[PDB]
Structure 1
Amino acid sequence: RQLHARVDKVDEERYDIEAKVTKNITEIADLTQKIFDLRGKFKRPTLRRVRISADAM
């Protein structure tokens, strides 16, 4: 029964570390999302194939 209480509380605790790393991952997602914004400001203008049909004809 000590084990039953242990598994109750430790199930709780592993679910809790679950939610904690879940918040870590959610904030990785959101902060890295605003960081996608930050670095996109810098890198999007070149995601393009340019100066191909300029001369070939």
Structure 2
Amino acid sequence: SKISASRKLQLKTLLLQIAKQELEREAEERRGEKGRALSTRAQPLELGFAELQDLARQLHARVDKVDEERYDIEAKVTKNITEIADLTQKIFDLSADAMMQALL
């Protein structure tokens, strides 16, 4: 070989560190993106009696809206879990320290 096995092992180790680093940052971007989406999709409350009970009914109906949308995307994720499980099954089808003491 044209470089030492110790070098290729050093490079492989450093490659994994920075890939892990890119994974971590990607998770931090996702956190910040989630907060921005929630500030848009769930603007915090800003508070008369009649206007209050109109709002509460609008919020009550919105709860029903969101939970139906959230179910609809959960159904797609669920079939993807079963599909992944089907594709994964298709791919499947395709000691020394006691010696040194006893010798020395």
What TM-score, normalized by structure 2, do the two folds share? 0.37
- 1:1-57 equivalences under 5 Å are 1-43=50-92
Residues matched between the structures, number: 45
Q: CA deviation at 1:44?
A: 6.4
Computing the radius of gyration over CA atoms, which structure comes out larger, 1 or 2? 2
Letter in 2 for 1:9: Q
Please report how far the alpha carbon of residue 10 of structure 1 lies from its aligned counterpart in structure 2 after TM superposition. 0.9
Structure 1 residues 6-27: Cα deviation after superposition (integer angstroms, max 9, x where no partner): 1111111122111111111111
Output the CA distance in 1 between the equivalents of 2:61 and 2:93: 44
Instruction: Point out where structure 1 has 5 or more consecutive residues left out of the alignment.
Output: 46-57
Q: What CA RMSD, in Å, does the superposition of the two structures yield over aligned residues?
A: 1.9
TM-score when normalising by structure 1: 0.61
Deviation string 1:24-44 (CA, Å, 9 cap, x unpaired) is: 111110122112111121236
Structure 2 unpaired stretches of 5+: 1-49, 95-104
Taking the aligned partners of 1:5 and 1:43, their CA distance within structure 2 comes to: 57
